[PDB]
RNA sequence: AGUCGUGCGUCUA
């Protein structure tokens, strides 16, 4: 019918968005340029993310500059932080494609294999006649190179002699093409991969044809639909969920469109997702789960492998498909990956026969993967991975799209999976958690860091999960009072936690705040990261005391986690712990940054604050409330907060936290050798500070 | 203001 034809055309347009404008915009940039913005255009062009968008054209106009700025910042970060291995190529004939030049170059297979150049990688090319052959070429030369040109890899054709033909796409108007003479050596170095940027741009362009385009532009969730309480109670009993969680799931499923579920950490977010999936399956309807990071996808796959109960209580295990590489995905998820499933399902005359056999094998693999995708019910992947070419070729509509950590991903990433005719979308995320990853502070200033879920929450209040179990009630007290503004209720196990010990002792309590009377932090110019020795010494002393108290009674294998805002501080702590304790720190203690440590929960969490000097009133990342909430919510039983008293007291949120700790008598002055009575200096300092 | 998630492909003479 006409409607079917229109839907097919819209799907084809969404899945076949041309990338030429993106290439034209990107290639005009100068690699050697060192500025906060790709060009020198007036700042007025950039605009903050509007809450309401009049039409798709305005939304695209607002978003495109932000995407370009983010891409430029990522390019600069790759140029500076990372130094890819340079290589050299020989220029060939040039083809004048529409507003582009495609250059064919011959390169060695070993060189590209070592560098790691794929068909969707961006490179920067330069001509260095004075470059000595023996000189160690590096990204510094490219940055300081007089002439540079951005190029995009198009095709990689292998040919006898180990010769790879590479088609590089460059901007036609770029002057560097005058140096692209036949049989000319050009030094090229990789910059970054454009696959994610290309997918985001395609989604931005195709948002017009999206079914939920109106809802996204308005950002208004569909009105709640009343449901019978008896059905909610029956679902809760069948799935063994909580009353609030069951009500939220029922309300989200009943209404068609975007659904907002605010799950604070420890509120069974994975359990809530499992319940939603089971309820939807009980009521083929493919469901696409997308998560910002591969770790979340792996966790969801592991949880699903155990099976999901239905309303009747009969556990079942729908075929789950993981769209991801084996190396990036967890080892346990290797079996669930598409490649392994296809392999399991499958189980010059000679030259021609070998070629025919290879083609037949490729066709069989394509057929097997297509069949698996068609029969699969649950497809778990990442936001960027949801737009994989295989899925686009399949063109199978996904009625239900679940988004995890909606507050940890950008709007474009969240909308990417919706391209496959997504009529029902369920986004779950906690705004108090870490904001979506952003490389540019300027982009954040334009509200680019703000995600779609944030606007949806502003328009309408999501269904906050009040009940939490893993988090200790004392730990969740202050976040509930301030971060969540209440609406949090402790679970039945308020004080019946299995890890009872190391709590009765006065020195060790569920929540503590051991400030440092004196502490000096040194900043490294190369990394611009502060490092303090007092925090490291205090943490080492506390860990040693804890181990001595329970060296043999209880094993701390994967139960102690030290987190600091700064990467350099965490690395220094890991090095010191390895030097002092030895190899036992590999498993007993886990060292990682607060942002990196997100998603991991441990019995004991040591939150070490590096900001100690009071000379500068600036607070830094500690000022943000979301980071503090993430740091505090990752603990279960014991929290050890380390940081200078005055520096933290400068901030309003930290001042309130210190006041609450004083009210709860959780403040205890600490310094070097706090638990070392032999060192009389520490005791004297503590007495004087009193 | 000092840190970070995301992507790629495995047989070719």
Author numbering: 1095 to 1377, 1403 to 1466, 1534 to 1876
From the paper:
Here we analyze the mechanism of polyadenylation-independent Pol II termination mediated by the yeast Sen1 helicase. Cryo-electron microscopy structures of two pretermination intermediates show that Sen1 binds to Pol II and uses its adenosine triphosphatase activity to pull on exiting RNA in the 5′ direction. This is predicted to push Pol II forward, induce an unstable hypertranslocated state and destabilize the transcription bubble, thereby facilitating termination. Sen1 belongs to the ancient SF1b superfamily of helicases.
